């Protein structure tokens, strides 16, 4: 309703330091920079209760639902299979490790919903899951949901060359951990190029992003960034939309390799369905 309008930027008519770069591509984390306070109000941290550790990123889509990658909760080849009592969701964070008193809100999960057809056996196809919070979180200056794309938003923004933004507390190199939430703006890549960069079978529930080894700009999601949001700002209504979920990639920021994202619009029907089915 109020989705994708950040209290500290859109609302007060302030621009973050790199959004122009997004907007300028619509034809007007490794190697990221620190995010500004309240730059990604929908960024959520998937936290492990015991031991206490960051599991993945995630995003707030309403006051009671968090969107993340299914491989964040379930990956049988690595004996990964989290229950709602296994995790904690931390919202409104900036600092990676410190408990941001009076700023962040920590929530408990009521229910985890994995895509019934999430393909963990082969290529992480349909890598998405919903988590419904035990109680609605209260919005604030640092906590605010992102918008989910509609068919025509997906249509006009999801184009090769158009940049999106990925955020996370993930590794700083394939082989570093930030103290503060990192950002990187990356271009969407043509699907043939995506396909030609890997042996894994790319489905329509996916898109890849990153620069060309030739383009001379770098950046990528990395370990711990999983389940985080790939977002775009609509130049039509000025809102931030989540187009993708950090899914998989081979290494972090390797030349001729790209990050792969769950195609949120393709799976929006399943999202709606479970949201007003429960």
């Amino acid at each position: 309703a109020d989705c994708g309008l950040r209290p500290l930027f859109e609302k007060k008519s302030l621009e973050d330091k790199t959004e122009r770069e997004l907007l300028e591509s619509y034809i007007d984390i490794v190697e990221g920079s620190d995010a500004e306070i309240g730059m990604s109000p929908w960024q959520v941290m998937l936290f492990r209760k015991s031991p206490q550790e960051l599991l993945c990123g995630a995003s707030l889509i309403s006051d009671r639902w968090v969107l993340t990658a299914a491989h964040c909760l379930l990956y049988p080849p690595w004996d990964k299979n989290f229950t709602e009592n296994d995790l904690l969701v931390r919202i409104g964070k900036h600092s990676r490790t410190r408990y941001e008193r009076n700023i962040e809100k920590i929530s408990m999960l009521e229910k985890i919903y994995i895509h019934p057809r999430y393909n963990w056996r082969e290529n992480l196809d349909r890598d998405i899951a919903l988590m419904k919070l035990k109680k609605p979180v209260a919005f604030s200056d640092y906590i605010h949901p992102v918008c989910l794309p509609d068919r025509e938003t997906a249509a006009s923004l999801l184009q090769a060359g158009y940049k999106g933004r990925v955020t996370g507390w993930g590794n700083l190199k394939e082989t570093g951990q930030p103290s503060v939430l990192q950002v990187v703006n990356l271009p969407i890549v043509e699907r043939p190029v995506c396909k030609d960069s890997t042996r894994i079978r790319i489905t329509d529930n996916m898109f890849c992003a990153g620069y060309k080894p030739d383009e001379g700009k770098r950046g990528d999601a990395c370990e711990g960034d999983s389940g985080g949001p790939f977002v775009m700002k609509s130049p039509f209504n000025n809102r931030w939309y989540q187009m993708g979920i950090v899914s998989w990639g081979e290494g972090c920021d390797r030349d001729g390799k790209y990050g792969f994202y769950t195609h949120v619009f393709r799976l929006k029907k399943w999202i709606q369905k479970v949201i007003d089915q429960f």
Binding site: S50, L88, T97, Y99, I106, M108
Partner: peptide, 10 residues
């Protein structure tokens, strides 16, 4: 690596 969180969260 993490600062402890309010016990009531666990």
């Amino acid at each position: 690596d993490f600062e402890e969180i309010p016990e009531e969260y666990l």
